[PDB]
Amino acid sequence: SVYTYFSAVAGQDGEVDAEELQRCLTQSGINGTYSPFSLETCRIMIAMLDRDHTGKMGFNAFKELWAALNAWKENFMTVDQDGSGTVEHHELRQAIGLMGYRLSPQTLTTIVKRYSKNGRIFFDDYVACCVKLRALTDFFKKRDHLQQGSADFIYDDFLQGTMAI
Amino acid sequence: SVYTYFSAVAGQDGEVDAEELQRCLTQSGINGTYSPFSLETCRIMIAMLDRDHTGKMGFNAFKELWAALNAWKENFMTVDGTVEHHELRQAIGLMGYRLSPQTLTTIVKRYSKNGRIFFDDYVACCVKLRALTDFFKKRDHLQQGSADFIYDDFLQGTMAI
């Protein structure tokens, strides 16, 4: 019943903005026993799939988001050794590697320190991390024309993309 | 009594993490009638002044933040709980940012709700614009308005902010 939750909050244009996406996801109960999603997290979700640069999301893109969310949640449940509903530093760093990222120790530490609350990473931040990593990497890859692991950005292009995400 | 609010929530290390900063600012009343700052906004505030990379902020940095916050708040209260699309663009330009029409629209579209911008979002925008520009400026050695980023460095800076 993915469509039921989506259509219940979509605007007359048949799309959801971040606030409506938050409402849709919350009503769907996809987070299960974990924390519900925050508006910021949903804003990053919109950015991740915002190919039209509109701040909105149609159902086809939502379907893609839904499947990705299903996947990241499973990964969370997998690395969440204990039940708790929150993961420890080591488990987050592990999850990131599990998703295919090869980040330096310093970078992983930066990510951990931004989200850590009493040494734990809550579900909303875990997902925000997954979505933001993907969106920033997609954005970066498009400017890495020679496929070298480097990119040269013009200020206005850099600011547009990073402010959006 | 800025220090009073700060020290009331600061940790054993004399610094505040994002959650403590959120509490500090709320208890300080800087928010007034407007809606309190979100955890995300406070996280960007820390990132903006996180020179030693710890995800925490000491009082000296907080003093700088407090001054900036008060200034952006005045603009919000005197450049008009929300503002409109036309006014946000205005504020961005006034802060010295000369961006393209598309870039300004993209920024406005991320926060816009029913055509309005809430106080928390207005400030988040101000803080993020400053953090990102500082980060970018540091890689623009020739000051050409362009900057190289090695993937890992790019991710570290943008995930922190």
Swiss-Prot record, chain A:
It comes from the Eukaryota. Residues 1-31, 37-70, 67-102, 103-128 form the EF-hand domain. One of its GO terms (biological process) is membrane fusion. The keyword Nucleotide-binding does not apply. GO terms for cellular component: azurophil granule lumen; cytoplasm; cytosol; extracellular exosome; extracellular region; plasma membrane. Its main location: cytoplasm. Detected in neutrophils and macrophages (at protein level). Highly expressed in bone marrow. Keywords: Calcium, Cytoplasm, Membrane, Metal-binding, Repeat. One of its GO terms (molecular function) is protein homodimerization activity. Ca(2+) 2 binds at residues 80, 82, 84, 86, 91. It is a peripheral membrane protein. It is found in: Cytoplasm; Cytoplasmic granule membrane. The keyword Kinase does not apply. Ca(2+) 1 binds at residues 13, 17, 19. Calcium-binding protein that may play a role in the adhesion of neutrophils to fibronectin. May play a role in the formation of focal adhesions. Homodimer. Interacts with SRI and LCP1. This protein has been shown to bind calcium with high affinity. This is Grancalcin. It comes from Homo sapiens. The lineage of its organism: Eukaryota, Metazoa, Chordata, Craniata, Vertebrata. The chain holds residues 53 to 217 of 217 of the full protein.
